[PDB]
C-alpha cells in the first residue's frame, strides 16, 4: 500500500522551494540555508505506524503517524499544525492546518523517483528524491 515509499531517499532536484517558503513567511536567512540543503528522507513502517525522518546538516525533523489519523506536528519552520496523512490514488497526501491556513505535501512515485509537491496559497514547489 505504502511499501513503494519505504526506504532512504536523497534530494536531487528542487524547483521553487524559495517561493513556497516565502509564502509561509520563512525568513530570508532560513530560506538561504534551505536553498543549499539536500535532505535525506527516511520512511519506515512498524505495523500501521509510519515514521518519516528528514535529515540534513543544518536541520532534522521526525514524525510518526497512522494513515488517516490526525496528529500534532511542529514543522521545520516552527509552525504548530494539525496534520493528517492519507493514501489517495497511491499518493501519500500530507495536509497541514493552522490558523485557518492549509498546506499540502504530496508524495507520488513517478519513474522510480519520489516527487514531493508542496502547495501553499498559489506557490507550488516540486522536489525530486532518488533512492539512496
Ligand atoms: O522534505 C522536504 O524536502 C521539504 C519539506 C517541507 O519543508 C519545509 C516546509 C516549509 C518550510 C520549511 C521547510 C523546510 C524543511 C527543511 C529541512 C531540511 C532538511 C531536514 C529537515 C528540514 N528546512 C530547513 C532547512 C534548513 C534550515 Br537551517 C531550516 C529549515 N525548511
Ligand atoms: O531505500 S531506497 O530503496 O528508497
Ligand atoms: O544535483 S545533484 O545533487 O543530484
UniProtKB/Swiss-Prot annotation:
Name the residues that bind (9Z)-octadecenoate: 127-129
Superkingdom in the source lineage = Eukaryota
Q: Where does hexadecanoate bind?
A: 127-129
Checking InterPro entries in the record gives: Calycin, Fatty_acid-bd, ILBP, Lipocln_cytosolic_FA-bd_dom
Its subcellular locations are: Cytoplasm
Instruction: Locate the Phosphotyrosine modifications and list their residues.
Output: 20
Q: Which GO terms describe its biological process?
A: brown fat cell differentiation; cholesterol homeostasis; fatty acid metabolic process; intracellular lipid transport; long-chain fatty acid transport; negative regulation of cell population proliferation; phospholipid homeostasis; positive regulation of long-chain fatty acid import into cell
**Residue positions of the PTM Phosphothreonine?**
8, 30
Keywords recorded for this protein, A-Z:
Acetylation, Cytoplasm, Lipid-binding, Phosphoprotein, Transport
User: Which cellular component appears as one GO term in the record?
Assistant: extracellular space
Q: Name where it mostly resides.
A: cytoplasm
Residues at which octadecanoate binds: 127-129
**Has keyword Protease?**
no
Which GO terms fall under molecular function for this chain's record? cytoskeletal protein binding; icosatetraenoic acid binding; long-chain fatty acid binding; long-chain fatty acid transmembrane transporter activity; oleic acid binding
Q: Which residues carry this modification: Phosphoserine?
A: 23, 83
Record note on domains: Forms a beta-barrel structure that accommodates the hydrophobic ligand in its interior.
Which family does the record assign? Belongs to the calycin superfamily. Fatty-acid binding protein (FABP) family.
Q: What does this protein do?
A: FABPs are thought to play a role in the intracellular transport of long-chain fatty acids and their acyl-CoA esters.
Q: What is the name attached to this protein's record? A: Fatty acid-binding protein, heart
Source organism per UniProt: Homo sapiens
Q: Which gene encodes it?
A: FABP3
Amino acid at each position: 500500500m505504502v511499501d513503494a515509499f519505504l526506504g532512504t531517499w536523497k534530494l536531487v532536484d528542487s524547483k521553487n522551494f524559495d517561493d513556497y517558503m516565502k509564502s509561509l513567511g520563512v525568513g530570508f536567512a532560513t530560506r538561504q540555508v534551505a536553498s543549499m540543503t539536500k535532505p535525506t528522507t527516511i520512511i519506515e513502517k512498524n505495523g500501521d505506524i509510519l515514521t518519516l525522518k528528514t535529515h540534513s546538516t543544518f536541520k532534522n525533523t521526525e514524525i510518526s503517524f497512522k494513515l488517516g489519523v490526525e496528529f500534532d506536528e511542529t514543522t521545520a519552520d516552527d509552525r504548530k499544525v494539525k496534520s493528517i496523512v492519507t493514501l489517495d490514488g497511491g499518493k501519500l497526501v500530507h495536509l497541514q492546518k493552522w490558523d485557518g491556513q492549509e498546506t499540502t505535501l504530496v508524495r507520488e512515485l513517478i519513474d522510480g523517483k519520489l516527487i514531493l509537491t508542496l502547495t501553499h496559497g498559489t506557490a507550488v514547489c516540486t522536489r525530486t528524491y532518488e533512492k539512496e
